[PDB]
Design a protein around this ligand. Structure first.
Ligand code: NA
Lengths: 285, 285
């Protein structure tokens, strides 16, 4: 009975919400708020614990980029602070390999990071690894074949269709085949041995198009588009299906949750979040 | 029969309101809207004309920092554009010396300005002067003894308790005694030869504390606090009393207007604005 957790987000200002959706019965739980309101963060799970990584506190009286790492225990309904990252990372990408959290790119004020760091929960320590070949904020991250893929984003000048792959054993990055579409703030996940990149911003419009990377052919192929165009959407995989949560369509902050069935190549609206928001962190446990 | 004018502000989005309060009879006038919505702007008066300087248009369709200078004539109820500043300046500080407008600090996207520029209404021209020693956004500005004081703010990393002074004849800045409290977005004004810094934000809390700088002793002393904590408040002096307008208390956008009587060292609520808002520009004419 795993749940889809959504942490933080943005609607007029950064949000503290921690909510959990049950795809089986369609119910939503209201869990303990984040200690600091954050948008542009990422979520991940290690050993049944939910982690909220980086982001930014956007408030009417001023803004603060976050280097924070916070851990939520579903059994206790409590958030606990962890060691912070070396730098603040807003619009961060995150992936997990062997119980270690990789924090990828993101921004700190005018700085667009190419730097990458890894967290060890057993030691509560962060350590820098090899930086990416490109500076990437609003970057999508996917773990596939024990490699860490960094997809699209924004380098400070241009939104990107480029993508690269990290080899943990060799501690190095290599560029892979570029996507068909330029995407910053896309939802990036892994489903049935393929990397999916859904929505995002091409530098002009928020996108509803969805493409998938097949490792064997090293090609990106378009699949069925989402019903709603969205950037800064949350994404996850639950029981062989992709779930996209909220986002921004250029005018509205979406409460829509769409579900992709790979067997039928179709998207359907499954639920609505309690309120519209973009820039959430999402994970399943 | 001078009026307290409040221009722009923020509530869900940047506002276009121009309203004028009469402290003698408690009435509010609804004047011509600003041509462009703006929050984080500053207001000032030169030769009976009201000026709206800098700010930002925060809308659901995007955010744009403003380099605009607009002039309102109370006799015609008309806004007229003036020459723009060299750069956009959101959360700007403004002061007037010898009929010249000084535009101090503020932000442009991720940039935190230390730059300062001066407007000459007779020539409709802006010119840069010596930059401040510190980058300051959400900076409070006060003119005292023909010197321009820049108080607190945010440098891009930390909210500040520091303050500095500009010498127009020498074209140079000098650091002065730091405040007792770190304050960004405080209300800063001059009353009876003292600089007052009321409220503000420290990165964690909105403040109700008020302190005053005495030039002779070069010391900051706390006076009676305001009834409501507020950051990004509007401030002005009218007939020997300080008026604080709106702001943000960490939850609500205030419509509250408080008045400080220096003879009794007491604050009282005198009126309410027609709607709650933060980040207004305020001036008296
Ligand atoms: Na907030």
């Amino acid at each position: 009975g795993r749940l889809i957790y959504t942490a933080g987000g943005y609607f007029r200002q950064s949000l503290s919400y921690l909510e959990a959706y049950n795809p089986s019965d369609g119910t939503w739980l209201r869990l303990a708020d984040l200690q600091v309101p954050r948008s542009g963060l990422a979520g991940c799970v290690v050993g049944g614990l939910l982690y909220a990584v980086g982001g930014r506190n956007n408030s009417p009286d001023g803004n603060t980029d976050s280097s924070a790492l916070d851990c939520y225990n579903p059994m206790t309904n409590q958030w606990s602070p962890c060691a912070p990252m070396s730098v603040p990372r807003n619009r961060i990408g995150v992936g997990v390999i062997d119980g270690h959290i990789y924090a990828v790119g993101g921004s700190h004020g005018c700085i667009h990071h190419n730097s990458v760091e890894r967290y060890e929960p057993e030691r509560d320590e962060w350590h820098l690894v090899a930086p990416m070949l490109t500076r990437r904020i609003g970057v999508g991250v996917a773990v596939l074949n024990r490699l860490l893929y960094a997809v699209g984003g924004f380098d400070g000048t241009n939104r990107l269709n480029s993508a690269e792959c990290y080899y943990p054993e060799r501690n190095e990055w290599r560029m892979i085949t570029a996507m068909n579409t330029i995407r910053s703030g896309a939802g990036v996940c892994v489903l049935h041995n393929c990397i999916y990149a859904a929505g995002g911003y091409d530098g002009q419009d928020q996108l509803n198009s969805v493409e998938r990377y097949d490792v064997a052919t090293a090609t990106w192929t378009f699949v069925a588009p989402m019903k709603h165009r969205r950037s800064a959407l949350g994404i996850t995989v639950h029981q062989g299906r992709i779930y996209v949560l909220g986002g921004y369509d250029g005018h509205t902050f979406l409460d829509s949750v769409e579900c992709y069935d790979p067997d039928t190549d179709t998207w359907s609206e499954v639920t609505r979040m309690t309120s519209g928001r973009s820039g959430v962190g999402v994970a399943v446990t």
